[PDB]
Design an enzyme around this catalytic site. Structure first.
Site, PDB file in Angstrom:
ATOM      1  N   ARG A  54       0.831  -1.216   0.000  1.00  0.00           N
ATOM      2  CA  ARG A  54       0.000   0.000   0.000  1.00  0.00           C
ATOM      3  C   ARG A  54       0.864   1.264   0.000  1.00  0.00           C
ATOM      4  O   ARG A  54       0.661   2.182  -0.814  1.00  0.00           O
ATOM      5  CB  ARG A  54      -0.959   0.017   1.193  1.00  0.00           C
ATOM      6  N   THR A  55       1.836   1.332   0.908  1.00  0.00           N
ATOM      7  CA  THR A  55       2.705   2.494   0.934  1.00  0.00           C
ATOM      8  C   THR A  55       3.469   2.631  -0.378  1.00  0.00           C
ATOM      9  O   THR A  55       3.515   3.716  -0.973  1.00  0.00           O
ATOM     10  CB  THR A  55       3.680   2.387   2.104  1.00  0.00           C
ATOM     11  OG1 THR A  55       2.938   2.414   3.328  1.00  0.00           O
ATOM     12  CG2 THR A  55       4.722   3.520   2.065  1.00  0.00           C
ATOM     13  N   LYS A  76      21.975 -10.316   2.372  1.00  0.00           N
ATOM     14  CA  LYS A  76      22.527  -9.119   2.986  1.00  0.00           C
ATOM     15  C   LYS A  76      23.494  -9.454   4.122  1.00  0.00           C
ATOM     16  O   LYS A  76      23.079  -9.650   5.265  1.00  0.00           O
ATOM     17  CB  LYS A  76      21.408  -8.215   3.508  1.00  0.00           C
ATOM     18  N   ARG A  97      11.779   2.400   3.055  1.00  0.00           N
ATOM     19  CA  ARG A  97      11.193   1.792   4.236  1.00  0.00           C
ATOM     20  C   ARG A  97      12.066   0.645   4.742  1.00  0.00           C
ATOM     21  O   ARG A  97      12.520  -0.198   3.946  1.00  0.00           O
ATOM     22  CB  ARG A  97       9.784   1.284   3.924  1.00  0.00           C
ATOM     23  CG  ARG A  97       9.013   1.063   5.182  1.00  0.00           C
ATOM     24  CD  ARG A  97       7.662   0.491   4.901  1.00  0.00           C
ATOM     25  NE  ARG A  97       7.021   0.125   6.151  1.00  0.00           N
ATOM     26  CZ  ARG A  97       5.776   0.438   6.448  1.00  0.00           C
ATOM     27  NH1 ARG A  97       5.037   1.127   5.605  1.00  0.00           N
ATOM     28  NH2 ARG A  97       5.274   0.066   7.600  1.00  0.00           N
ATOM     29  N   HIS A 126       7.070   7.781  10.600  1.00  0.00           N
ATOM     30  CA  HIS A 126       6.469   7.555   9.292  1.00  0.00           C
ATOM     31  C   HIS A 126       5.917   8.891   8.798  1.00  0.00           C
ATOM     32  O   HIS A 126       4.701   9.079   8.649  1.00  0.00           O
ATOM     33  CB  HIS A 126       5.417   6.445   9.365  1.00  0.00           C
ATOM     34  CG  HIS A 126       4.966   5.952   8.028  1.00  0.00           C
ATOM     35  ND1 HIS A 126       4.092   4.889   7.879  1.00  0.00           N
ATOM     36  CD2 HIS A 126       5.196   6.432   6.776  1.00  0.00           C
ATOM     37  CE1 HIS A 126       3.836   4.709   6.590  1.00  0.00           C
ATOM     38  NE2 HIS A 126       4.487   5.639   5.900  1.00  0.00           N
TER      39      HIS A 126
END
Ligand SMILES: [Zn+2]
Ligand SMILES: [Zn+2]
Lengths: 301, 135, 303, 301, 143, 301
Positions: A54-55, A76, A97, A126
């Protein structure tokens, strides 16, 4: 004039009252007057170290709405600093994010001149969520001052609700109602912040006590995952909102939810004129066009 | 010598002060005396900056630093709590990006009634110095 | 005229010194005067059959810097042949950037893409042209030349494909001296040394970078492929060959330290702040080598 | 004589004071006198619907210590009732652990004559854990009555600590100290239970307040996963136990942990004579031999 | 001189603070006097440590061998030397060294490190008690 | 004197020559006269922190062939803690672990419970070298004065280092190391051999020496470490086909610690020279051997 050009947007606690006003105004102006090639030839990095589609969709839509290019990833042994040091050479802004708190702040120390925008850094900040909230409260109420604002649900854990309280305390004469179970109360640091500014706040156990007064009914997403299934059964029973609860509501009042709203707002509300959480999400595109454009131009319009 | 000297250091804080602030990574002569009970450290041809002494406030609060340009004192001082403490502290929030990453720690400092509050530059959480300092 | 138009970019062993010079030149030209719409209305498929998001991001940024559209995937999480996948995608797009676990896959693609050029983002242990190209572009931009250089290569020299590529490519320029600094189990392979001898190019072995630091122009650090070795023997490699700022007192001021990245266990972060650290600048240059490749394969003309 | 023969062991709230005494006594007698063929030719089902290999190893060791056979599994569109209805035909007792509360109770309604033993049913009960706790407190202290018992850590969520309080309130003159942060307090239902029996309990903020008095230092496993990483940093700082905290301790005092003890008890304690959490786990074999033998024989010895 | 205790002379400068840290030499209540970058024509620039009412055993002094090979320990009873000593390479070195093998069980677990010691031509070999791998002291000591 | 009673089995470098001869002797005697209740009432823990179901099955079978009970598992809390717990449960601990040193680490926390090492990462695997020896014993009649060829990967296989180390503890053996340059026998083993004045030569093909070899020992080439190109040339050079056994001695036996997919073609299976399944079969007696030797003070066979 534009004091946010080439600045990073990291934490709401770093945006000044004037900075807040500048974004909101830019958002309203961008909403009313599309400027779809304002950022042509810019490339922006959509870096979701922690997935959140969504973001990510909201941001990337903001990006193309200003005609930018977008590159990125959604999931990573190498450090975050190295990743950012590389990506800064590629792109003109980094939207990011991350699961860990401090990741955007840290990115700024290795991004050089490239502005970093925080799409959420673990438990911390946020900024864009609080920005599109404010833009929705302001656009619906006509103002951000002298409002009756209830915040219902889990207030201990949502970063965006602490965020939104801080930002609304930058405006004055607001009256806050905190309607939440004891295990999920507003944290002390927020209450103290409000006391040191002589800002009005009361506790309640049910939205019915105060519904008559509220201009904003702001529902949080209760983080059930932290709770016992039994305990959550009692919370959801108390604090879920259905349309039957809106008899006293002021005709101007709006129900807002950061989403997803499954266990908090019954679908009864959707059909009522008080339902504004989808309009709220839609408004995220303009709070985000605003932030992108302000950091990537010194000139307004 | 014509340098700087630290008197009245709480016992077992002398070795820590030498350790945390890399005071033994110089070439000058250093005199150190642990448990008199008062620890004391002294460094020849070494002058400490303004805020550089301030950083000792948290570990040797009631302690004296004396400056030497002759075989006598040229200036005496006590440490005052600073605005920020860099490099030496570790953030208690284990989710803090600060860990495993090539950055120096940094905490804003804030006095309180009973505790000293230390707010991290990165994860933006505030802790009581007793929690931060417990290694 | 432009002998790379509509050509595939598959292997450093297929590019002539002339092809190399054309890429390097086009890259530098694009770096200094951007051409942000040279590839408008082009659609390029970014098909990373094997994830590699630094490579993907650098390529896709390149495409957009020339105003191309991008479609694709970075899928690391399948019964239909690769031939068919390429057969289909070539009808969709104008150029195919491709990374794949199996050696030869970009070559195999070119046989099914028809007129659509494929560029190799890595095909298993074989080739990775773009890395070696942006290396060349970096050494050039920093030194002023690709000839008469002292080039040291430290770390794993048996296994990294890009370091073979880079030696092959530097052997197309003149008067270079190579120092190979590696543990015996990870030496430069024999076929590379044979090649350098057959051209009479100077190379010596070393056990320690301090032997040569005074002479070196490019210190090219490879990524030691830890996974192949015992953690015990790897302890001895990392101990010998890790690079820290204490190693750069003798170095010439023109010297640049290069690493294809990730460099966690090869280059200490103390180096980062010295003037010799050029591995992030190196990675930024992938933009220009990859813009270059795209441009040359998709136009006959030059602006 | 043996009122537990062919009974299910489901919830500590169903074992009577006399039943508790019977198990403990049987455990002590089994510990002192091995009876390794008491359950020869019995087959027992070790059904870990929810993995838990410390618990499973402890039970299965109990089982072979009585010379039984063991069959089972350690990890479904078909109902639990169907599974149990099948497994009852195979075996003579069902030891079972399940993520959902009520699973052992429900199994009994479909196991027929085969006794069900609860190895933990989600958030509800874990009878054997409380049993081996009691056997360890009793064996070390000489008694379960008139004891000073501190319980330190997370007291809101651990089922076994609620369990253990209930079972110790079946013995009298016990003094309870609850040393835990506000968000993880002892629940109301437990305090009320203690008040209705006129049983003594006080709150404290640190084990140092009362260390001088305690006979049992019972450390819980704080469920960090429920908390913010910052909040947990403060909890672990307060409530971790290291050997330096044991200067006042009574020479008879014992430190008990249900395990795993990573973030609660420093390894300093291991070397001190107060460290009894491994002896505690070892004691689990006899509390479990006890339960198995009592439910699968009417005759003692 | 001191009333009673131990003294460590001729320590390679910059190895003095290391000795205080690695062997926890400042974790006493007795008086300790130390001097880093002291001047001597015997050493050049040296380091010196002195501890009242504390004696080091054979192995406690041997354990300094790996860090300060040429160094001297003097025992001071009634303000005069009663026993003079030098460090000899020990048979094993516990607690202070770290296994270079990153997969060694040694690391995440609550045990003390331990390496058996064996001199060679150019280096000292240190064989880990746990993973049984042998390393050059230079690999072990290189952080 | 059973100088292995209650002793740990950790590393082939800790086993004395008499210790080896004792194991082999107990193996041959248990193989010839089974003792299926020797360990009645014993419980053994099969702790495979790292899966290895060939090894696990062989061990657990040994455990049952001596009538022992078994408990176990495959695939923040320390190993010290788990071992401290399990030793209170059981009488012996067989354990496999991905990390070197894990079994030695266990012994320091197992109390009086002996731990046997099923493999600790790249370090040790005693029982494998034991059953290899027992197999050379039974097939050749002796461990001394044998021609032993070792073909394949000799840089990485722990089992082949163990086996070389242990054969150098017997006399008059001549070693042939047949391996590609990148996977040669390490110097530390060659050094050990010179320092005992033991004769060994290098060869690049098994054909050079087949006529003399009494034991042909194939390793599992570790494909994963090498390039698939590199591996193609290795597999062609060093794979063994039955056509390669025309020169072999009628007593010569082929051994493979297993799995042999890419080293010994199926041609070999049918020739009398193939003893790698019989080798694996013998693992039962070498592991029975250790269990019996470590858990009984007397053994009259
Ligand atoms: Zn922090
Ligand atoms: Zn080790």
């Amino acid at each position: 004039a534009n004091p946010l050009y080439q600045k990073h947007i990291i934490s709401i606690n770093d945006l000044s009252r004037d900075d807040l006003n500048l974004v909101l105004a830019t958002a309203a102006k961008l909403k009313a007057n599309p400027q779809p090639e304002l950022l042509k030839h810019k490339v922006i990095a959509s870096c979701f170290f922690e997935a959140s589609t969504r973001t990510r969709l909201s941001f990337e839509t903001s990006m193309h709405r200003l005609g930018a290019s977008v590159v990125g990833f959604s999931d990573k042994g190498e450090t975050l600093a190295d990743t950012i040091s590389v990506i800064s050479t590629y792109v003109d802004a980094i939207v990011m994010r991350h699961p860990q708190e401090g990741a955007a702040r840290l990115a700024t120390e290795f991004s050089g001149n490239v502005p970093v925008l925080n799409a959420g850094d673990g438990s911390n900040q946020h900024p864009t969520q609080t920005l599109l909230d404010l833009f929705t409260i302001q656009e619906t109420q006509g103002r951000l001052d002298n409002l009756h604002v209830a915040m219902v649900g889990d207030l201990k854990y949502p970063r965006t609700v602490h965020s939104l309280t801080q930002a609304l305390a930058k405006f004055d004469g607001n009256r806050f109602y905190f309607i939440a179970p004891d295990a999920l109360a507003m944290p002390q640091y927020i209450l103290d912040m409000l006391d040191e500014k002589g800002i009005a706040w009361s506790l309640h156990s049910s939205i019915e006590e105060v519904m008559a007064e509220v201009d904003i009914l702001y529902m949080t997403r209760v983080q059930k995952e932290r709770l016992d299934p039994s305990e959550y059964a009692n919370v959801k029973a108390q604090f879920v909102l259905r349309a039957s609860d809106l008899h006293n509501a002021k005709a101007n009042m709006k129900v807002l939810h950061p989403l997803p709203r499954v266990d908090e707002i019954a679908t009864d509300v959707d059909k009522t004129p008080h339902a504004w959480y989808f309009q709220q999400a839609g408004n995220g595109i303009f709070a985000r066009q605003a932030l992108l454009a302000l950091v990537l131009n010194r000139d307004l319009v | 010598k014509r340098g700087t000297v630290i008197d009245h250091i709480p016992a077992q804080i002398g070795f820590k002060l030498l350790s945390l602030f890399k005071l033994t990574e110089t070439d000058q002569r250093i005199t150190i005396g642990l448990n008199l009970r008062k620890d004391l450290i002294k460094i020849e041809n070494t002058f400490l900056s303004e805020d550089q002494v301030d950083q000792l406030a948290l570990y040797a609060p009631q302690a004296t630093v004396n400056r030497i340009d002759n075989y006598e004192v040229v200036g005496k001082s006590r440490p005052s709590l600073p605005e920020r403490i860099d490099n030496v502290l570790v953030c208690p929030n284990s989710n803090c990006i600060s860990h495993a990453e090539p950055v120096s720690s940094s905490f804003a400092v804030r006095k309180r009634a009973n505790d000293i509050a230390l707010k991290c530059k990165y994860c933006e959480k505030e802790f009581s110095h007793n929690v931060v300092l417990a290694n």
